[PDB]
Amino acid sequence: YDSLSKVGIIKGLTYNYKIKGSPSTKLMVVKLIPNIDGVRNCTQKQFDEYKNLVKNVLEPVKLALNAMNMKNAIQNTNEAVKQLQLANKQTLAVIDTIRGEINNNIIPVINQLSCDTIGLSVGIKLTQYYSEILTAFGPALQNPVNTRITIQAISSVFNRNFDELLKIMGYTSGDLYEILHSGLIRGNIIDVDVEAGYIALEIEFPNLTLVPNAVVQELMPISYNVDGDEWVTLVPRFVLTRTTLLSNIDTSRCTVTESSVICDNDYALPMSYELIGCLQGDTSKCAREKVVSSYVPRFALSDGLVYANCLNTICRCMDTDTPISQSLGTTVSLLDNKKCLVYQVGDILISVGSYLGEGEYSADNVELIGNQLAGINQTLQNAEDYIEKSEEFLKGI
Amino acid sequence: YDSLSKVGIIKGLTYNYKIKGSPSTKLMVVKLIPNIDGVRNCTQKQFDEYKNLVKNVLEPVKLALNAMNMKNAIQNTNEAVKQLQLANKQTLAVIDTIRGEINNNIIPVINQLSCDTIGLSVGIKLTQYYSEILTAFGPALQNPVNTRITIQAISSVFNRNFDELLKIMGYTSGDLYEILHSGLIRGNIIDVDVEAGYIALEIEFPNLTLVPNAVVQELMPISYNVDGDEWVTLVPRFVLTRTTLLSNIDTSRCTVTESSVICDNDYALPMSYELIGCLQGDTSKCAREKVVSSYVPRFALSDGLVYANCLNTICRCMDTDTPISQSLGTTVSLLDNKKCLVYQVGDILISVGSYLGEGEYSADNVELIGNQLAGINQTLQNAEDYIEKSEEFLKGI
Amino acid sequence: YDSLSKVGIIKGLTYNYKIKGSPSTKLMVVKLIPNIDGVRNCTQKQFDEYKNLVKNVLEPVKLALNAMNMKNAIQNTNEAVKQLQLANKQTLAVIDTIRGEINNNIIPVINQLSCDTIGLSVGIKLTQYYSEILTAFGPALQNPVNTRITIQAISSVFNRNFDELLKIMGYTSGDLYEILHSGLIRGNIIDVDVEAGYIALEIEFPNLTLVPNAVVQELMPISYNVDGDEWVTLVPRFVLTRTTLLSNIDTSRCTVTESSVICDNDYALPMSYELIGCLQGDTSKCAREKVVSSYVPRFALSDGLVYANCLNTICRCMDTDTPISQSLGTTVSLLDNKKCLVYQVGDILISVGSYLGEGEYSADNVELIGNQLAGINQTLQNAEDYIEKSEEFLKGI
What we know:
3 copies of one chain form a homotrimer.
Chain A: E1 16-19, H1 44-57, H2 62-67, H3 70-106, H4 108-137, H5 139-142, H6 151-154, H7 162-168, H8 173-182, E2 189-192, E3 199-201, E4 209-210, E5 216-218, E6 224-226, E7 229-233, E8 238-240, E9 254-256, E10 260-263, H9 273-280, E11 288-290, E12 300-302, E13 305-308, E14 333-334, H10 370-394
Parallel strand pairs in A: 1-10
Antiparallel strand pairs in A: 1-4, 2-3, 5-8, 6-7, 7-11, 9-10, 12-13, 13-14
PDB class: viral protein
Keywords: Glycoprotein, Fusion, Viral Protein
Assembly: trimeric
């Protein structure tokens, strides 16, 4: 690239080149189902319900398996005393009655209910276990489709340290970020067992290989006003540059990222010398053509950078009587937020968003006989005390 | 396009053209963790378990942080009465015993257990909170990979009204449907804090710009029988048409939808006049070639519309002795469900599905001492009543 | 293909060809919400909370709806006895007191609390129902975006038998595996009702049609050393071969899989005879060009199969003083794990992973007055027994 802004060529982002062609198939099955058991037969119903739910959610995937006056009176009063004793017997009866209720269900059954409540807590733990299942595979558990594998499944092998994971194997920041943002890893379920509860999935560990000085720029063709006509140069929108000798870039089967391009194989091939000469400054070798369509854009846009050309189109931003433009020699002019509030290139309205960010969303808020006994004891103590002394010493031998 | 059915050109679907080149990066962090606290120290264990689960599910993502005879007898009977009083004392003892149990654990501890049950309900609410977390980001929470952002996260900013959201910013139905069905939005996690519990993600609000009269038709080349040979015209499968002057369409880096095509940038370029002349009716300028491969299809298929050519191939649908065809001039003939039950164009079996729809799936179904006391009181009342009057008036001064 | 290894052409994987062009739109709505009701008004709060959660998670999606000295003494002692009777009355009072507590909340309210615990279990079941919802659609429930539909939703129509599902409709293993690993099915939500709780989604049942003998090989161009220069033949990286007459392959709008390529329509077209002649052995017709870029690879890589060319580059694996190479006639040489421990072709380090598989991850582990009554009864029985006989027979007529 040189000082050739007059032909409408504009550089863009630089993308690194990486190669992934090393597979690995050494999968081994490791059990991960949490152990559940009953010690007091309280969680048996909960265990059965959990097993039924696990069976229901876990499809048998058989398709994959197949494919791959006084004298009498003192007597009568005594009888009355006996009647009082009979009344005491009746009280003894009530002593059993409430006790029978205590013997019926009050003590044991309620206590058993308490264990059920503990089982309920276990059920809550089961729900947490379900979350641990959900974070285990996520979408991969739903279907055996190649998709992003959860980081928690790949990590936490021995000490959950990501630094050790990235240091044990030679890797850089760029390829790791590309993998973590694109999802080049692939996952497929092998077999699912309802009873033993083990799920095996194909773990993918790509080993990206980089190429030194594998820089490539993006070119946006822009028509230029030469003489009276408007000429446009036929140049590919993506060409690799390297000192003097370079080659073209084919994106028919390549995936691009924020700052790199990922391709399964290599596609380098020799390119014609005419294009190299035209890019080097020889405008005569460039294939110029007259524009015959109004749909050809006169301005380029790259990640919010607008090269507005006000020589032919309009660049009104806030008013309609300001014919701001540039010199005849200059073709592309930068139009950023430092020139006007809301710039509108051409006759098409374009601007940025007004509000953007994480909206406020709150889930919920958590909010919030002693005297009688003493009197009875005193009466009992005093009565015998004043009756025994009175009766014993009054009559004797 | 004109009346040129003899050369095998067939129009298809029309796709609108839109441009997205305006980014926006003004992300701000807003807390969304539901407040949880304990008032009676009952949910402390539940709170600790929830915090541990949150820490376990939320990876520290340190990689992203680093990168970016008577006289004696009446005495003895009295002693017996005292013995009965002693028996009453024994009853008093039992009065404490059961009461001691009431004082031990019956009243307080069970009540405390009740609070635990309330905590269990809180735990259930926690599970609901987990669902509110799951709907918050979904897959985006699992990994920082560019994917579809949940509508509930973007919406519900102030009043959950989608109409206000679509009216505040200028948008149409087509681009909104394309975004909602394709997932052009991108999402990346910035930072995750275990303690404060805030998660920040890159919110994407694309601003699609439309182009008036940006219609483009799809062309399917079909060989035609001229003289004895079968000639096929070399025409691109996707070319834009606009009155008279038009241009070609390049789909090497463009994504197509049901009724539109989305491209990051513009790709308009002048096209040769020979192709325009050939498309306009000048069959001489068309590049005709003799077919030298049996794999070339003699019929076209577009969204269930079959242009079966029975002149050369066969069009048996229900029998094998019906040579139904068309005139020599006509090349493509429509073959819909109104002509035969199950049409089979050529020697390849093709038909529609037999059963399609939402299958029936049901989760589960929810299914479902008074007399003794009165007698004791009456006996107590009558005994004293008939003993006091008898004793008092019988003996005196 | 013939014995033409000297020109650098290497065969690769074979991909089958399939056509999908038969849509189907006969969607019908079927209710799937589990029935919930209250029999004892215990789950009313739980039902309200579940309904509120369902309303919150289920967006109204209005955008889609709009778009589409003695004498006195014996008296006094009797009064004392009456006092004892009064004490008994006091005991009767306590008989009510505890009973009042039993009548207050001990029996009924606690029992009501028990029903609440049952409701808590129902709440746990509700969480399980949520899981049944999560497995119902998964990501499709989150947004109406075309993605993989869960197998459990498509299956379980009548007897959950996958064999019957694959036998009722004519299908093979290859296309079924391609669908299950790529996700060609599309899904879109039609309408969502909060009250009736029915969700309708577009079910996709592709009917892939195969083409006999639709085999195609992959060709990787490799430069060859002829005379002093290094010549590379210009040959497309993907060309179909069939006996003698064949045609080119265009992948501009085709998706490739592990062992097949899926395209929406057909793209067969005649190819020039010069390329066929060059591929058949006529090296004169081949378009050879001198390499003018060092980025051109001298070795090919295909699924871990490396054709290392040590004639020009280096093939050091374990040492740096071993110039192992091949004969001048041979250009490509296989370099597998049976030749060296860690092979490094050229000056770029490349190898396989060290550790790969499912890591160990454990969620959690589940761990674990009779004597007094008899004495009172004996005292009561003996006292009356020895007092009645003594009193009755001592005094009489």
